[PDB]
RNA sequence: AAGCUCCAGUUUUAUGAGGUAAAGCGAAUGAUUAGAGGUUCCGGGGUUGACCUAUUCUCAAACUUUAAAUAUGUAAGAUCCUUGUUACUUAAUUGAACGUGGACAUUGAAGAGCUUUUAGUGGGCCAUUUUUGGUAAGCAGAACUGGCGAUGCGGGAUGAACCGAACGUAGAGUUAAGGUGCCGGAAUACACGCUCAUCAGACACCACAAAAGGUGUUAGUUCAUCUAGACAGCCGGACGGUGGCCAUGGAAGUCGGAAUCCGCUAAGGAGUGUGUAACAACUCACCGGCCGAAUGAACUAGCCCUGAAAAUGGAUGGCGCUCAAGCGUGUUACCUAUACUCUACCGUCAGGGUGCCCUGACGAGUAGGCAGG
RNA sequence: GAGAACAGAAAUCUCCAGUAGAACAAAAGGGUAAAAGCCCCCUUGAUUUUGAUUUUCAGUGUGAAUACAAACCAUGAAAGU
RNA sequence: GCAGUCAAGCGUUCAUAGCGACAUUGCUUUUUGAUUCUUCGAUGUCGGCUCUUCCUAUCAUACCGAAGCAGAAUUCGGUAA
């Protein structure tokens, strides 16, 4: 649903962006997202810290 | 002089040390002069300026500095004659070297005690020359470009830190430097 | 062994003041009196000569426990060891400076605290925090028993 | 294509920042990458290189990716390149024959790697710039390919299995 | 251990502080130095004006303070009101702030408080980071931390402290680190590129290899020259203003020291080197042809060799392959620990429940304490 | 720096310009301008008693210091010190 | 101890037949120091004799390069144990 407002607004957005540098003006999306954390790496060779 | 290669000196030893209270009777600066050639001349006559710049982080010996700079000077003053162009040494020699000086055999080892023991007795001066630092900045005219370049080549085999010859830009070039009057 | 241990050593950066702070201090600072429970930094001014703490104590924050004549009594905590005790320091007002951070902290919580009261009457912002604070608590409040509870972790078992 | 080579991800964004009448202005770097893992990274490295920012000050608005627009076929990519070897990074413009942007990456990597010194830590590049077939200048592999489009020359080049048959 | 009793941390806010680079103060090697006021001496000439010191604006880097440090670890620090009554230091004077008595209203999770008694020291070590001494050292001596000691097992040829990993038992599965030509699980894997020395099968390591680095090795870059014809070689041409001022025994193309125009014009420079005391030729410049397609100079990095010499016998662990079994770039699939998950179950502790049964978590161990046998 | 015969060591005295580069018995470094420096007077509190606490040392003494209150005086306008 | 680079310079003239400073990078482990790893319930010392095996940085012999090699004594240097 977030993505729809950008899509609706902009024809312009895509073509310019693949071909060259610069960015266009008018809108922008903020985002939240919660996280999950898994510990890959062990205790060996680290501070207690 | 007295041998030690520069295996002893070249890597970056010591919390400096060359502080003026803490060392009466250092052995001398042996560098004959820092600016050379036309000392009575501004930078601005010369359209060419050539530099010599380090690849490594070192302490260069005072003797190596004079030996490299005199070797360059004999090439300049023989080919361009006595009243040539103009050279400046970038780096003066003021880092002070300690080394312990040749014991004895008395079974007197170090007679000290066992020892050694700070307050080591000074062996002379070196210069810090860190990565990308410029040892010589030379001002010349393009019909003697070649002469300064071979003088800079004959300089390199007389210090151990690996260095590169380069053409300068600074502020400007030499002619965006000149339009305001 | 060798050399000293010593109060004055290692002071050169701490003792010394900026080009701007240099010159005689202003007697207003000397004049200032404080109340118990005020929060004060201790860091000695170089430009006062006497009243100075051990040098090692500077940059710590303490609470004015009591005063006895011109100098004031500050509680601060040091660090390291076993069953470390909190210390009283006699440290002058010239060397003691206010702390803004709690003052603005106090105003904000209190300014907030008025906004809430009206909300408690007619409004529901919260709700969960409301449930402990009516059921909760006297102490009276404001007591010296809470201080050893804080005192006890300062000697840290792990660090040791 | 199959299992990438580096589709360029057109990453866009902002900044997005503070209570001041400022704000950073609108940017692009279109960076060659494998997807979003790479996407993030490059942006922070670009933000280090040119810009300055932060991580937090750089805000990513959107992502749009890369397949084949134009032909598989036959740019001979002009690449602006930097290789890190026995000190830091030295400038390069390398114009080499390729199929495509997927390929370009591999052919350059193989060239930094082998020829130039390259190892891990690197990064990448600055730009890739298309060119007309006849224009292509430096030179070995491509000179033959330019000639091939020509043709006749495709009738040339036609060589590789050649010694094998009998006919 | 044995018991007693029922709080810990962290971003964020605020403080002040390591530091070390370019200014300021102080020191200052220590140049170069123009401009420019003034020292003080004599010494010559027609107030001026040669002669040495030396302010003053003014210029290459070092070092100890300090800004602003930039940093980064840090690094301490996170109830209110009213009423009465009492005190208080300080003009028979002004105030607060004390203490009471009474009422009113307010991202974390056992990491945890206290006591008695007990033991082994009270000789350490290595690595990482930051060092300090020392030429250095499998050195000395600090800091901050992990490991070894006291820690197995898997990797690394072996191998206290390197990587993975913290271990009750037993099994099945799947993995780490790291590896897949054979030894040797598991690929003679897939896309490509370089290398031909047997380089080379190597994180760290008693793993060596430098300055110098050639270099026409390969590659890359930067600047110039090319179909208007470069380039290797071979071939080939040159009249005239006029043998040019200064100086000197003497420069006259070519010892030193000037300007630099022009004829005509394939083209024919007041000249590239070879000369004699000096003059005294011949070539080249500049120009043309025979050929036809790229070209050379500067830097850089791989590779590589060159630098490259040692003692009882050859190795990268070994055999020893070289569009790889090298090395680098990407990439697919496999293999592989006591790990992790799970099954069963032994101790502790949560606890529950009826001398006994059950749930789930944690669970290597020297010195050593305690408790059961 | 200038100014004053003689005097160079030349105080000396004078005028200007002069913010911590001076002075402050003694290392070091820090620190301060009607100052804690310099001067003039007056004086004895370099008194006795007790010492909260820190440094000692995180709990361990002497010693040291920073603060008192009692006792006593000084100078000082007095506060105070 | 020996080597490499650079080559100031000397060699009548000529860097390099030969000699070669300053500087500078290495290598070896066979002098000397440094250390404190190993051994203080014990490693027999120097030196010499004699018997063996080795090394290459080669003094001679073999083959070669250069020369300031006329011969020729020679000098320097390569390969080589």
SS3 per-residue string spanning chain C: CCCCCCCCCCCHHHHCCCCCCCCCCCHHHHHCCCCCCCEEEECCCCCCCCCCCCHHHCCEEEEEEEECCCCEEEEECCCCCCCCCCEEEEECCCCEEECHHHHHHHHHHHHHHHHHHHHHHCCCCCCCCHHHHCCCCCCCCCCCCHHHHHHCCCCCCCCC
Q: With CB atoms and an 8 Å threshold, state whether D26 touches A18.
A: no
Sign, Cα dihedral of D42, D43, D49, D53? negative
Q: φ and ψ at C116, to 5 degrees?
A: -65, -40
What's the CA gap between D96 and C42, in Å, rounded?
A: 69
A41 contacts chain D (CB < 8 A): no
Which distant-in-sequence residues (6+ apart) come within 8 Å of B47 by Cβ? B141, B142, B174
A9 contacts chain D (CB < 8 A): no
Beta bridge pairs of residue B59: B128
CA-based nearest distance D11→chain A, Å: 8
Name the method of structure determination. cryo-EM
Residues of D in contact with A21 (CB under 8 A): 27-30
What's the CA gap between B18 and B125, in Å, rounded?
A: 9
Instruction: Return the number of other C-beta atoms located less than 10 Å from residue B99's C-beta.
Output: 14
A20 contacts chain D (CB < 8 A): yes
Structure tokens at A14: 């895509």
Q: How far is the CA of D4 from the C1' of E185 (A)?
A: 31
Show which subunits contact A, needing at least 3 CB pairs below 8 angstroms: D
Q: How far is the CA of A45 from the C1' of E338 (A)?
A: 20
Q: With CB atoms and an 8 Å threshold, state whether A18 touches D29.
A: no
For residue B133, how far is the Cα from the chain centroid? 11
Residues of A in contact with D31 (CB under 8 A): none
A14 contacts chain D (CB < 8 A): yes
Residues of A in contact with D127 (CB under 8 A): none
What's the CA gap between B9 and B7, in Å, rounded?
A: 6
What's the CA gap between B128 and B141, in Å, rounded?
A: 30
Q: φ and ψ at A32, to 5 degrees?
A: -95, -75
Q: With CB atoms and an 8 Å threshold, state whether D66 touches A18.
A: yes
């Amino acid at each position: 649903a977030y993505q729809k407002e950008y899509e609706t607004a902009e024809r312009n957005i895509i073509q310019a962006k693949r071909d060259a540098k610069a960015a266009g003006s008018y809108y922008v999306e903020a985002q939240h997202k919660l996280v999950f954390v898994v510990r890959i790496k062990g205790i060996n060779k680290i501070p207690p810290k | 002089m007295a041998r030690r290669p520069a295996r002893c000196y070249r890597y970056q030893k010591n919390k400096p040390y060359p502080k003026s209270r803490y060392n009466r009777a250092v052995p001398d600066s042996k560098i004959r002069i820092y600016d050379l050639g036309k000392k009575k001349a501004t930078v601005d006559e010369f359209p060419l300026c050539v530099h010599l710049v380090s690849n490594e982080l070192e302490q260069l010996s005072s003797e190596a500095l004079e030996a490299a700079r005199i070797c360059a000077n004999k090439y300049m003053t023989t080919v361009s004659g006595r009243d040539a162009f103009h050279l400046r040494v970038r780096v003066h020699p003021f880092h002070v070297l300690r080394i312990n000086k040749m014991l004895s055999c008395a079974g007197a080892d170090r007679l000290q005690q066992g020892m050694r023991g700070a307050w080591g007795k000074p062996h002379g001066l070196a210069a810090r020359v860190d990565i990308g630092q410029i040892i010589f900045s030379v001002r010349t005219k393009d019909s003697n470009k070649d002469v300064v370049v071979e003088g800079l080549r004959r300089a390199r085999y007389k210090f151990p830190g690996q260095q590169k010859i380069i053409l300068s830009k600074k502020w400007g070039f030499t002619n965006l430097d000149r339009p305001e009057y | 062994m060798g050399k000293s241990h010593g109060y004055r050593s290692r002071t050169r950066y701490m003792f010394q003041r900026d080009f701007r702070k240099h010159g005689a201090v202003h007697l207003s600072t000397y004049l200032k009196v404080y109340k118990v429970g005020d929060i004060v930094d201790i860091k000695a001014n170089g430009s006062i000569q006497k009243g100075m703490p051990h040098k090692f104590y500077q940059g710590k924050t303490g609470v004015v426990y009591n005063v006895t004549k011109s100098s004031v009594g500050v509680i601060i905590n040091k660090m390291v060891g076993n069953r470390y005790l909190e210390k009283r320091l006699n440290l002058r007002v010239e060397h003691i400076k206010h702390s803004k951070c709690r003052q603005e902290f106090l105003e904000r919580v209190k300014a907030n605290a008025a906004k809430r009261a009206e909300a408690k009457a007619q409004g529901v912002a919260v709700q969960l925090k409301r449930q402990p604070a009516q059921p909760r608590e006297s102490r009276i409040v404001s007591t010296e028993g809470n201080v050893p509870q804080t005192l006890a972790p300062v000697p840290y078992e792990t660090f040791i | 294509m199959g299992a990438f080579r580096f589709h360029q991800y057109q990453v866009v964004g902002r900044g997005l920042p503070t209570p001041t009448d400022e704000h950073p202005k609108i940017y692009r770097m279109k960076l060659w990458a494998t997807n979003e893992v790479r996407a993030k990274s490059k942006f922070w490295y670009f933000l280090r290189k040119l810009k300055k920012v932060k991580k937090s000050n750089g805000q990513i608005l959107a992502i749009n990716e890369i397949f084949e627009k134009n032909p598989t076929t036959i740019k001979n990519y002009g690449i602006w390149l930097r290789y890190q070897s026995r000190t830091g990074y030295h400038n390069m413009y390398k114009e080499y024959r390729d199929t495509t942007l997927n390929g370009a990456v591999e052919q350059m990597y193989t060239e930094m790697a082998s020829r130039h010194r390259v190892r891990f830590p690197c990064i990448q590049i600055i730009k890739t710039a298309t060119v007309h077939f006849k224009l292509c200048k430096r030179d070995n592999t491509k000179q033959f390919h330019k000639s091939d489009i020509k043709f006749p020359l495709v009738y040339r080049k036609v060589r590789p299995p050649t010694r094998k048959l009998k006919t």
